[PDB]
């Protein structure tokens, strides 16, 4: 006699997927989303007359769970075509900027990346079972920086790879676990060309929101937005879920899909396992934010890295023309290096990277300040990947999903989808008995 | 429209099981009709010499996205056939001479030949799931695999190796085998030899292929009938009438055909299928393969052999060995016409030619090419076929088409069958579940 069979908390990819699995089994399913929008760490908006992506958007057929969903819903890819770069820049930690010939720039990053991931085959023969090998468990005592220091890289190569890794970390590279990066590279066919093809080449036709909506529509689930969950109590062979207006909703099972860094907001009765509590206390690393800048000048096709002590860590042309000028897409590794919502500070930093540009407008999303993310994409610290089963583990009638909890493409939309499929299976084991 | 079922799925291989699961979970009243007295189709697990053997498809990989996602859904891990040092690697040339090659050199040479064959896969197939995306792919579809092989400047050993390998993929001689199909598969495997090779015979599914088929059908809620071949489909009264071989008529809103392309001759269609689809049905797909296991008294250890296309034992691998057992060999025959796998004397003589001094204790075989419900083996495209694939995929009113042959990606695989089932489910939903 519960209100619902299953409640899914969070309406990102993990929650949408889990709700779709549950709904198609015939379970009375409710999804609760804290924000007034669906999508979570995916969010498409508009700036300077154009569509922009504030969070995750890029996918690939080597990412199996999301690719299969795209087949199911009939969604093709939209290509962001790869072109000759007009300009490739590196800013070092001291703020000096160097223009590198684009062919040399690309050659150097490839050298550094392949050196960093040289043992991916040996360490991750089964990238979807990250602790299969004793070598992977041993490497989880190391940071990415520990490895970088042994590679014999040139000054340019070291700055490039450190910038790239600080981006993946959303943090300084001394804090970033090594195995997580190797595992991702392994997921991409243990090959630089294939892996790199997964990063910013393809989006989904109709967008991420189209796929979220297709899954929720398919699910038949009830969906409530602007309803943050503040507590879960296990009681009467089910759960009592408390919302921020103090409404109580009862269910047989609850699937938590909220980002790991937001678990501090939620009371649990009884207490979660010690291992899970440890994860909730540490969180995941990333402190990233996303920024778009509209510049009067036509800069053409540009790319820049900035190393970790600087704010504009990844810069790419989103669009350009004589009429438009240039829209720059920028990813900030660490919120503390810049306030993306302070237009003067942004302008000064952009001008340091590109002397002579006039800034016409900015749009930003500070994922690290948003109470319903408190961080960006999933990134593991030293020693975390080894303990991941503690985060995955069911806690009675509370199940756990989200990209952080996936085994494969954990920094991605795909990992979220993966975790939702797992959650649906775990719900089915609790509700649909073998008889 | 008062039909017996909302949807009928014809065939209980991976494509049909997938399509039935997609339809069943939408709440459609779903029926699956399977001709054989078993499910699985071109996957079939059996037993020989005290052990489990695979007579058809069985090996999978996480680079194969549709099947991998299903394995996540149903909680199925992998079972590894471990890679070991090979004790022997042999090549048999077309004239029947056998050379034992150092395993390190044997592996080096096949890599050289394969990489040379697939050198342009990045350029030709930037989007392996959209095979006709590039003009170059459409141009290459005028060429056979052999046309390319002749231009590669391979050594005698390399040429025999790669020709044996390609004859296996073709289930035919390499002069008939379309080039783009092979390049596309390589592209699907991360455009990389090591990744692609890992997909071939490394991992099986925990609980077997039949466990996955059963998990999907159980999940579906669909009614399943075995030993019911369909002999005709007539579109009529806003739906279809399906005729079985006992002349029973079953009505439905929609039907999904998942039977192998080479078996379409057995089925009458009203109205007639499109000219494009008729052309495919007339040509069929290439493969004329069979599967064979041989139990040998001697312990041969871990062995591998290629035989070129004029010989019968084209792919040989140790399935198991020990002093007590002797050896069980797993053998794939590219073309039925080169040997009768069900004639034990002939098999024995061919095995002894490859391994002089062995005593054959028993054999088990499955002649896919003779089975009326496959009439061929794995999907393989002839010259110019890949270019026209949309004609085979295209819905014909309320009859939808699926099966591995009709997939865009891993067409020679379980994964392609799954892919085609997901598509069919979507097409069913568009016909049945209206926008209002
Ligand atoms: C800037 C950026 C760029 C990225 N780019 C890519 C990329 O290009 N490609 C890619 O594959 N991945 C990318 N990622 C990662 C990808 O977006 C994520 O891995 C994925 O979206 C995570 O999905 P999820 O469902 O696990 O979490 P989320 O999407 O965060 O969903 C969790 C949901 O829980 C809700 N919630 C939180 N607390 C509560 C509460 N108390 N009650 C109710 N609801 C609550 C949130 O509002 C949210 O909707 C990017 C990430 C970021 C931040
Ligand atoms: C020897 C062999 C080895 C292989 N190895 C691998 C491998 O290792 N890995 C891999 O991924 N792939 C492999 N494959 C390919 C893979 O098995 C197939 O691509 C896949 O199983 C095809 O699935 P399908 O559903 O399209 O067709 P099928 O499995 O052929 O299913 C079609 C079904 O339709 C039924 N049928 C036919 N006519 C009628 C009728 N008139 N009425 C009713 N039912 C009918 C058949 O009985 C059958 O059950 C192999 C194939 C073979 C033959």
Author numbering:
A (entry chain A): 51 to 485
B (entry chain B): 50 to 485
According to the publication:
To understand the molecular recognition mechanism of NicA2 for its cofactor FAD and the substrate nicotine, we first determined the crystal structure of selenomethionine (SeMet)-substituted NicA2 residues 21 to 482 [NicA2(21–482)] in complex with FAD at 2.05 Å resolution using the single-wavelength anomalous dispersion (SAD) method. An N-terminal cut and SeMet substitution were performed to improve the quality and resolution of the crystals. In both structures, there are two complexes in each asymmetric unit. However, as demonstrated by gel filtration chromatography, NicA2 behaves as a monomer in solution. The FAD cofactor adopts an extended conformation deeply inserted into the FAD-binding domain. FAD is tightly associated with NicA2 through extensive interactions between FAD and the FAD-binding domain. NicA2 presents as yellow in solution, which is consistent with the presence of FAD as the cofactor.
The nicotine oxidoreductase NicA2 is a crucial enzyme for the first step of nicotine degradation in Pseudomonas putida S16 (DSM 28022). NicA2 from P. putida S16, 6HLNO and 6HDNO from A. nicotinovorans, and the nicotine oxidase NOX from Pseudomonas sp. strain HZN6 (21) belong to the family of flavin-dependent amine oxidases. In the NicA1- or NicA2-catalyzed reaction, flavin adenine dinucleotide (FAD) is required as a cofactor to couple the oxidation of nicotine with the reduction of oxygen to hydrogen peroxide. The structure of NicA2 comprises a FAD-binding domain (residues 49 to 129, 250 to 338, and 417 to 482) that harbors the cofactor FAD and a substrate-binding domain (residues 130 to 249 and 339 to 416) associated with the substrate nicotine.
